[PDB]
Design an enzyme around this catalytic site. Sequence first.
Site, mmCIF file in Angstrom:
data_model
loop_
_atom_site.group_PDB
_atom_site.id
_atom_site.type_symbol
_atom_site.label_atom_id
_atom_site.label_comp_id
_atom_site.label_asym_id
_atom_site.label_seq_id
_atom_site.Cartn_x
_atom_site.Cartn_y
_atom_site.Cartn_z
ATOM 1 N N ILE A 259 -39.074 15.028 -59.854
ATOM 2 C CA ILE A 259 -40.236 14.533 -59.128
ATOM 3 C C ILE A 259 -41.281 15.635 -59.030
ATOM 4 O O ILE A 259 -40.951 16.800 -58.781
ATOM 5 C CB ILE A 259 -39.849 14.020 -57.728
ATOM 6 C CG1 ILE A 259 -38.682 13.039 -57.836
ATOM 7 C CG2 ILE A 259 -41.034 13.350 -57.055
ATOM 8 C CD1 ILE A 259 -37.905 12.870 -56.555
ATOM 9 N N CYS A 260 -42.542 15.255 -59.225
ATOM 10 C CA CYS A 260 -43.685 16.156 -59.115
ATOM 11 C C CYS A 260 -44.284 15.975 -57.723
ATOM 12 O O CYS A 260 -45.128 15.108 -57.494
ATOM 13 C CB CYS A 260 -44.702 15.870 -60.216
ATOM 14 S SG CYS A 260 -45.973 17.135 -60.406
ATOM 15 N N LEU A 261 -43.822 16.797 -56.775
ATOM 16 C CA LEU A 261 -44.361 16.787 -55.426
ATOM 17 C C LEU A 261 -44.912 18.178 -55.155
ATOM 18 O O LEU A 261 -45.979 18.533 -55.677
ATOM 19 C CB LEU A 261 -43.296 16.333 -54.422
#
Lengths: 75, 388, 150
Positions: free
Chosen positions: C84-86
């Site tokens: 995930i790209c957070l």
Amino acid sequence: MQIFVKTLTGKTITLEVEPSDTIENVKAKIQDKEGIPPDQQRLIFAGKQLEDGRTLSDYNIQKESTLHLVLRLRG
Amino acid sequence: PLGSMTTSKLEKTGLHVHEKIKHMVKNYGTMITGIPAEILGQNEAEISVGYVKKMGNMKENIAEVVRKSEMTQPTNSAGKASNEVCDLLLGTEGASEFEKSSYQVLSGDGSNLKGSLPNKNLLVRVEMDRFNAPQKYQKIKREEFNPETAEKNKIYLLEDQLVYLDIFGKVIDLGQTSDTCHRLFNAITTPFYQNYILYDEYIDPEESAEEAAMFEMGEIVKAKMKNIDCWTATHSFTIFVPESDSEDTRTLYPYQAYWTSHTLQQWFSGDKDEKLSRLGIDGYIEKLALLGTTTDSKIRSSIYGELFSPPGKEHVFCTGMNEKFSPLRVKFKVTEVNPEIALQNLEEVQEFIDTNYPGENAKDQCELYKIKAQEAMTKQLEMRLLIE
Amino acid sequence: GLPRRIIKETQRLLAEPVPGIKAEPDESNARYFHVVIAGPQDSPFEGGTFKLELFLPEEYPMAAPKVRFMTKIYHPNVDKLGRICLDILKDKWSPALQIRTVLLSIQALLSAPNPDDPLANDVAEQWKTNEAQAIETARAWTRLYAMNNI
């Protein structure tokens, strides 16, 4: 050792660094020359994203290596 | 027909400067930086060549990468956006001189900034720092401690000394006697606590000698770190303060981009510069000053979001993972803007856009700019990928 | 065996669950969490249940938890391995953030997907250039993979 930092616009600046300097130190030296905060930067070396805590030696960055300064990132 | 029968105010206002740079940024994006489209395309091929598929029809493989590139979209580096604003309003020579002047730390109530805004056309540049203090510690023996290779921005507890290894690798003593450190050293014995965090709220000092020591060390470091320069620059923006006639009628216009969030183009398109202008000079400066004096994370996050979020995201910009726990520092510098040269500078950029990327509307001039960048990128990639 | 923070975080996740999120520790590894996030209302993932695994590294809480989607999902911020790209912007992870904070942000990402580099992420290109079709694809994948899967 001298290294180079190139942008999308072709602008090249020269940095004097040591292999023990961290990526954080390099971003601070880019701030000193261009007025760009380290949090507004991404550095790439030979396709690899450079992480704040690692050193130039960790990426085998040597004399006259050219890093790419990315000034647009989504994500 | 009214062209030759009418004249217009030859005096250039600061408001004219504001509206023209806003208009040109909204309509032209990166093209206002003046870089030829072929330059962007050639350099984009350098960083994106690794994404092209290596087998099959290479002309098609190259076109897929060329079509997906975002090379002509504007920077969202807040520092790079401030540089371009300085270059246009001051000229490159004036911006180089401006970049050498000193930053001044904003005072607790913002008075020093208020007292540095004479009634002429001014450009303010701001650099905000965050306090990049250490969060972790490690117990280590002096024989095994080497600041040349140890992890930086970290606390090290030795049997006879407590030190802070800063971001540049310099060892800084934290004022503790060897009696105190010998106690703290030999009290911390649990394996997962030899290398842990400094400010764990779940450590109860009454529970054991080990937790009492860890808690004592945390109280020591927080006090000592207040006197050490751990500031690191995080955000950048500019404020155009046009000359007015009356002090009661003075307004300011902040300009900014923001990492992974928005461009100056989107900032203008959402009219957040005008929205913040409604706060007035002192009202804006007071929120800015409170950003640096508050010690409450929720207030810091609320103000940060109000001032620096993209238009519409004020209430969700600094929540969750983006809650502002770090103390902040606001620094500023001021210089005068000559409306005549700034408008001239913008007119010369308009000439470059019209001469090299002509079109009937701004959308078509930008599309032609991107096409020319794509064509240059295609040629570069076609040569590079002959190397299997 | 574990620092009190991990024990107390675990206790509060079980007794006070995040709305629309189920997060339970593994019986054989107290540093490992099995997570289910319900697709938010009015998102293309509405009605879906998405499995994730969360791991607390040795350096936690000075290092962030490691999280991955185990259920297939069509989302511009999730890659083919489920990463995930957070990431908090213009600052780093700090012990002031906790597991609950990460889980809340993933759920918020399902409602408000952020842009991503179209290169090496074709989902981001579709979301940018053909948002209605990309949302249509995300709905189909939600029905196929994220329903009756728990």
